[PDB]
């Protein structure tokens, strides 16, 4: 029994928590990502990258702290603590926004470690690892939003800053500049998420309300109830639960493809026939046109301060208004 | 039980005070570059210290500092 077998058995030994080989990648990376976020919110400010006060020392609130993204001038530099930017100076590394890269990269490797961990646990117990395949969706979302999107853009500056109000800013920015709500892939994502919630709710209620007076619930009564109330019903239990698994994951993957599309400005921003028809006559007004106008307004009123590095100067005259 | 209580009583408040003094003595501002409440602007230095170059960012901040 070489050192390797001893190490393997030691990893697989029962404890309060299971480590496994995956733990060697998951736990340090997850812990570092969490610590990076906590430090960035508690002490480091974004006064030099976004000109904001996003830390507790600054006096911010829990809803306004954020590990803000690096500056725009750095492009997609990895911002290593020992790179050409930081050059080993911790303070400059923090001020330049290196905590964002620290948190995001260690988060990527934590998610990878978690998926590997689910593979390993399912291998030990001896059941199909549908949990890992389910978790594949969140990894797709994470990779699409925090890596592929800022990589398709000018800089890391356009990535979602780790926070609450910063994420809200990201949502509104996406609507203003990419018109995301009109993207069909985001529509499939929304349908997937809302359908997953619907499935969870009605499945729970049905199982509770067809309980036997002692699996454990009257599948026959549930089937008849839904057939005569709604029209259709699951007559198979395995299909029912695989569908519950399948819907939200598919929604996440569709949204992921939508987000990678808008990372290249390959966005469904407008319908050509509507633009032409509005150009021909000014009376033609639909909800889509007014959405377009709202996008123009949000772009104009947010750009001077959101992308402060660009030194945008729009006077009051050029700002769109409802006159 | 009882034994660890002595150690935790001796230690935990010391750590709490360690963080407390790390903030109160102003060390955090130096460690993390976070401006003092008066350091956001001078009496008229209301311009923003935004980095414009990737290659010499730390030195440019030193100029902004």
């Amino acid at each position: 029994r070489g050192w390797f077998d001893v190490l393997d058995d030691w990893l697989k030994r029962d404890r309060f928590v299971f480590i496994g080989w995956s733990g060697i990648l998951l736990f340090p990376c997850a812990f570092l990502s969490i610590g990076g976020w906590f430090t960035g919110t508690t002490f480091v400010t974004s006064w030099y990258t976004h000109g904001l006060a996003s830390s507790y020392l600054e006096g911010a609130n829990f809803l306004t702290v954020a590990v803000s993204t690096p500056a725009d001038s750095l492009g997609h530099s990895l911002l290593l603590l020992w790179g050409p930017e930081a050059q080993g100076d911790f303070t400059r590394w923090c001020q330049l926004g290196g905590l964002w890269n620290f948190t995001t990269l260690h988060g990527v490797f934590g998610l990878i470690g978690f998926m590997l961990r689910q593979f390993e646990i399912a291998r030990l117990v001896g059941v199909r690892p549908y949990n890992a395949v389910a978790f594949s969706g969140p990894i797709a979302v994470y990779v699409s939003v925090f890596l592929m999107y800022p990589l398709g853009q000018s800089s890391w500056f356009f990535a979602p800053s780790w926070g609450v109000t910063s994420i809200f800013r990201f949502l509104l920015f996406a609507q203003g500049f990419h018109n995301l709500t009109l993207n069909p892939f985001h529509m499939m994502g929304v349908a997937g998420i809302l359908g997953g919630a619907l499935l969870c709710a009605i499945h729970g209620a049905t199982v509770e309300n067809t309980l036997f007076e002692d699996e454990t619930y009257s599948m026959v009564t549930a089937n008849r109830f839904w057939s005569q109330i709604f029209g259709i019903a699951f007559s198979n239990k395995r299909w029912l639960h695989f569908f519950m698994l399948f819907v939200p994951v598919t929604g996440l993957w569709a949204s992921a493809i939508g987000l990678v599309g808008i990372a290249l400005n390959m966005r469904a921003y407008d319908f050509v026939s509507q633009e032409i028809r509005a150009a021909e006559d000014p009376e033609f007004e639909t909800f889509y046109t007014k959405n377009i106008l709202l996008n123009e307004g949000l772009r104009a009123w947010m750009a001077p301060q959101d992308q402060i590095h660009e030194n945008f100067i729009f006077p009051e005259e050029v700002l769109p208004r409802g006159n | 039980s009882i034994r660890y209580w002595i150690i935790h009583t001796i230690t935990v408040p010391m750590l709490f005070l360690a963080g407390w003094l790390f903030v109160s003595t102003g060390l955090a501002y130096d460690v993390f570059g976070t401006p003092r409440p008066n350091e956001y602007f001078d009496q008229a230095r209301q311009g923003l210290p935004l980095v414009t170059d990737r290659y010499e960012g730390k030195q440019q901040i030193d100029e902004f500092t």
């Binding site: 508690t42 | 790390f22 903030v23 109160s24 955090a28």
Partner: peptide, 30 residues
């Protein structure tokens, strides 16, 4: 007595307590 769980508990608690103290200190800053 240095069990893996001891390491985990301390690696969590130590910085946690330090940061709680720091945030408390910030709360009393004018």
């Amino acid at each position: 007595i240095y069990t893996v769980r001891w390491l985990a508990v301390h690696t969590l608690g130590v910085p946690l307590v330090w940061f709680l103290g720091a945030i408390a200190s910030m709360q009393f800053i004018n």
